Amino acid sequence: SMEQVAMELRLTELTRLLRSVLDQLQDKDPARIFAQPVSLKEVPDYLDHIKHPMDFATMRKRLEAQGYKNLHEFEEDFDLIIDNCMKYNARDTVFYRAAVRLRDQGGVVLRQARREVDSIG
């Protein structure tokens, strides 16, 4: 149908916008602390602590499968990255501090993307 195509074009554009948003969020992690999943070889007990792991590579895979339907779902995953880290690592750690900085710096980027997604529909 012609509607299903029109939808598919919107999803594609949302995917295009969320791709730029992801690139901007990931620039705020220059140390690449959140680039890849926490290693289960190197942190064997991780899943006893964190029930829903997340990282930028895993968000990228979902993004390119057009698996984000709206900005809310995308933000849930970003928030997992941050909130997982702040629980698993203690306050006086390079890792916790990196998440606080990503949260603060990403907020600005997420603030504008919400307006762009409301604006462009």
PDB file of C-alpha atoms in Angstrom:
ATOM      1  CA  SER A   1       0.000   0.000   0.000  1.00  0.00           C
ATOM      2  CA  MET A   2       0.851   3.644  -0.467  1.00  0.00           C
ATOM      3  CA  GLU A   3       0.275   4.389   3.253  1.00  0.00           C
ATOM      4  CA  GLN A   4       2.765   1.588   4.340  1.00  0.00           C
ATOM      5  CA  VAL A   5       5.404   3.262   2.092  1.00  0.00           C
ATOM      6  CA  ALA A   6       4.667   6.786   3.556  1.00  0.00           C
ATOM      7  CA  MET A   7       5.172   5.272   7.058  1.00  0.00           C
ATOM      8  CA  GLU A   8       8.367   3.494   5.903  1.00  0.00           C
ATOM      9  CA  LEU A   9       9.702   6.892   4.629  1.00  0.00           C
ATOM     10  CA  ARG A  10       8.939   8.520   8.088  1.00  0.00           C
ATOM     11  CA  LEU A  11      10.645   5.646  10.006  1.00  0.00           C
ATOM     12  CA  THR A  12      13.582   6.024   7.633  1.00  0.00           C
ATOM     13  CA  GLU A  13      13.762   9.733   8.387  1.00  0.00           C
ATOM     14  CA  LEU A  14      13.413   9.131  12.161  1.00  0.00           C
ATOM     15  CA  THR A  15      16.246   6.628  11.785  1.00  0.00           C
ATOM     16  CA  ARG A  16      18.262   9.233   9.929  1.00  0.00           C
ATOM     17  CA  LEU A  17      17.638  11.802  12.738  1.00  0.00           C
ATOM     18  CA  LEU A  18      18.349   9.304  15.557  1.00  0.00           C
ATOM     19  CA  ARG A  19      21.580   8.365  13.745  1.00  0.00           C
ATOM     20  CA  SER A  20      22.824  11.983  13.965  1.00  0.00           C
ATOM     21  CA  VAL A  21      21.644  12.156  17.619  1.00  0.00           C
ATOM     22  CA  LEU A  22      23.571   8.947  18.403  1.00  0.00           C
ATOM     23  CA  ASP A  23      26.744  10.350  16.801  1.00  0.00           C
ATOM     24  CA  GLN A  24      26.450  13.529  18.889  1.00  0.00           C
ATOM     25  CA  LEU A  25      25.881  11.549  22.142  1.00  0.00           C
ATOM     26  CA  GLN A  26      28.777   9.244  21.488  1.00  0.00           C
ATOM     27  CA  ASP A  27      31.130  12.258  20.870  1.00  0.00           C
ATOM     28  CA  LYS A  28      30.468  13.117  24.508  1.00  0.00           C
ATOM     29  CA  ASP A  29      32.216   9.842  25.473  1.00  0.00           C
ATOM     30  CA  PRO A  30      35.712  10.446  24.085  1.00  0.00           C
ATOM     31  CA  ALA A  31      37.249   7.749  26.288  1.00  0.00           C
ATOM     32  CA  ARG A  32      34.899   5.152  24.636  1.00  0.00           C
ATOM     33  CA  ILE A  33      33.858   3.809  28.044  1.00  0.00           C
ATOM     34  CA  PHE A  34      30.320   3.133  26.738  1.00  0.00           C
ATOM     35  CA  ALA A  35      31.260   2.128  23.188  1.00  0.00           C
ATOM     36  CA  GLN A  36      30.874  -1.620  23.577  1.00  0.00           C
ATOM     37  CA  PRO A  37      29.074  -4.030  25.884  1.00  0.00           C
ATOM     38  CA  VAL A  38      30.606  -4.775  29.278  1.00  0.00           C
ATOM     39  CA  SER A  39      32.669  -7.949  28.686  1.00  0.00           C
ATOM     40  CA  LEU A  40      31.251 -11.073  30.294  1.00  0.00           C
ATOM     41  CA  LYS A  41      34.703 -12.715  30.006  1.00  0.00           C
ATOM     42  CA  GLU A  42      36.226  -9.813  32.047  1.00  0.00           C
ATOM     43  CA  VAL A  43      33.185  -9.155  34.326  1.00  0.00           C
ATOM     44  CA  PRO A  44      31.718 -12.631  34.736  1.00  0.00           C
ATOM     45  CA  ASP A  45      29.214 -11.603  37.475  1.00  0.00           C
ATOM     46  CA  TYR A  46      27.907  -8.548  35.585  1.00  0.00           C
ATOM     47  CA  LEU A  47      24.446  -9.947  34.829  1.00  0.00           C
ATOM     48  CA  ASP A  48      23.939 -10.665  38.600  1.00  0.00           C
ATOM     49  CA  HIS A  49      24.165  -6.878  38.975  1.00  0.00           C
ATOM     50  CA  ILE A  50      22.736  -5.404  35.795  1.00  0.00           C
ATOM     51  CA  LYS A  51      19.660  -7.037  34.308  1.00  0.00           C
ATOM     52  CA  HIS A  52      19.408  -4.915  31.169  1.00  0.00           C
ATOM     53  CA  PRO A  53      22.909  -4.098  29.799  1.00  0.00           C
ATOM     54  CA  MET A  54      23.261  -1.445  27.157  1.00  0.00           C
ATOM     55  CA  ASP A  55      25.993   0.326  25.147  1.00  0.00           C
ATOM     56  CA  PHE A  56      26.441   2.414  22.010  1.00  0.00           C
ATOM     57  CA  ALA A  57      27.327  -0.495  19.638  1.00  0.00           C
ATOM     58  CA  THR A  58      24.162  -2.375  20.652  1.00  0.00           C
ATOM     59  CA  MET A  59      22.046   0.845  20.147  1.00  0.00           C
ATOM     60  CA  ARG A  60      23.637   1.286  16.715  1.00  0.00           C
ATOM     61  CA  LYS A  61      22.608  -2.283  15.697  1.00  0.00           C
ATOM     62  CA  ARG A  62      19.034  -1.623  16.782  1.00  0.00           C
ATOM     63  CA  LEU A  63      19.058   1.785  15.032  1.00  0.00           C
ATOM     64  CA  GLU A  64      20.174   0.299  11.699  1.00  0.00           C
ATOM     65  CA  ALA A  65      17.517  -2.409  11.949  1.00  0.00           C
ATOM     66  CA  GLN A  66      15.096   0.625  12.279  1.00  0.00           C
ATOM     67  CA  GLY A  67      14.204  -0.872  15.628  1.00  0.00           C
ATOM     68  CA  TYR A  68      13.502   2.509  17.305  1.00  0.00           C
ATOM     69  CA  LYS A  69       9.839   3.565  16.706  1.00  0.00           C
ATOM     70  CA  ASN A  70      10.060   6.919  18.504  1.00  0.00           C
ATOM     71  CA  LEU A  71      12.547   9.070  20.431  1.00  0.00           C
ATOM     72  CA  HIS A  72      11.233   7.734  23.785  1.00  0.00           C
ATOM     73  CA  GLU A  73      12.537   4.176  23.049  1.00  0.00           C
ATOM     74  CA  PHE A  74      15.913   5.546  21.941  1.00  0.00           C
ATOM     75  CA  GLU A  75      16.188   7.596  25.143  1.00  0.00           C
ATOM     76  CA  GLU A  76      15.295   4.592  27.294  1.00  0.00           C
ATOM     77  CA  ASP A  77      18.390   2.841  25.901  1.00  0.00           C
ATOM     78  CA  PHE A  78      20.622   5.895  26.415  1.00  0.00           C
ATOM     79  CA  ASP A  79      19.422   6.182  29.993  1.00  0.00           C
ATOM     80  CA  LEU A  80      20.224   2.466  30.548  1.00  0.00           C
ATOM     81  CA  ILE A  81      23.836   3.080  29.607  1.00  0.00           C
ATOM     82  CA  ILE A  82      24.099   5.855  32.176  1.00  0.00           C
ATOM     83  CA  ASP A  83      22.007   4.325  34.951  1.00  0.00           C
ATOM     84  CA  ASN A  84      23.672   0.865  34.712  1.00  0.00           C
ATOM     85  CA  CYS A  85      27.075   2.462  35.088  1.00  0.00           C
ATOM     86  CA  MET A  86      26.089   4.588  38.063  1.00  0.00           C
ATOM     87  CA  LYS A  87      24.858   1.503  39.892  1.00  0.00           C
ATOM     88  CA  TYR A  88      27.654  -0.945  39.065  1.00  0.00           C
ATOM     89  CA  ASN A  89      30.475   1.511  39.651  1.00  0.00           C
ATOM     90  CA  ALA A  90      31.060   3.501  42.779  1.00  0.00           C
ATOM     91  CA  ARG A  91      30.953   7.312  42.873  1.00  0.00           C
ATOM     92  CA  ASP A  92      34.747   7.744  43.089  1.00  0.00           C
ATOM     93  CA  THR A  93      35.514   5.928  39.816  1.00  0.00           C
ATOM     94  CA  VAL A  94      36.502   7.035  36.342  1.00  0.00           C
ATOM     95  CA  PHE A  95      33.513   5.058  35.016  1.00  0.00           C
ATOM     96  CA  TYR A  96      30.820   6.684  37.273  1.00  0.00           C
ATOM     97  CA  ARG A  97      32.265  10.141  36.563  1.00  0.00           C
ATOM     98  CA  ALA A  98      32.187   9.486  32.827  1.00  0.00           C
ATOM     99  CA  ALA A  99      28.492   8.608  33.000  1.00  0.00           C
ATOM    100  CA  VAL A 100      27.670  11.789  34.954  1.00  0.00           C
ATOM    101  CA  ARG A 101      29.413  13.845  32.230  1.00  0.00           C
ATOM    102  CA  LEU A 102      27.621  11.964  29.402  1.00  0.00           C
ATOM    103  CA  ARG A 103      24.287  12.508  31.109  1.00  0.00           C
ATOM    104  CA  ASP A 104      24.884  16.256  31.600  1.00  0.00           C
ATOM    105  CA  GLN A 105      26.314  16.809  28.071  1.00  0.00           C
ATOM    106  CA  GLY A 106      23.770  14.581  26.332  1.00  0.00           C
ATOM    107  CA  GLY A 107      20.826  16.427  27.969  1.00  0.00           C
ATOM    108  CA  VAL A 108      21.396  19.423  25.697  1.00  0.00           C
ATOM    109  CA  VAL A 109      21.368  17.149  22.611  1.00  0.00           C
ATOM    110  CA  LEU A 110      18.238  15.274  23.751  1.00  0.00           C
ATOM    111  CA  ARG A 111      16.477  18.538  24.545  1.00  0.00           C
ATOM    112  CA  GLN A 112      16.782  19.673  20.901  1.00  0.00           C
ATOM    113  CA  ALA A 113      15.997  16.299  19.321  1.00  0.00           C
ATOM    114  CA  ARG A 114      12.681  16.237  21.235  1.00  0.00           C
ATOM    115  CA  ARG A 115      11.765  19.568  19.676  1.00  0.00           C
ATOM    116  CA  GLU A 116      12.921  18.382  16.129  1.00  0.00           C
ATOM    117  CA  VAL A 117      10.833  15.168  16.405  1.00  0.00           C
ATOM    118  CA  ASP A 118       7.707  17.104  17.568  1.00  0.00           C
ATOM    119  CA  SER A 119       8.344  19.801  14.887  1.00  0.00           C
ATOM    120  CA  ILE A 120       9.002  17.467  11.878  1.00  0.00           C
ATOM    121  CA  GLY A 121       6.284  15.021  13.128  1.00  0.00           C
TER     122      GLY A 121
END
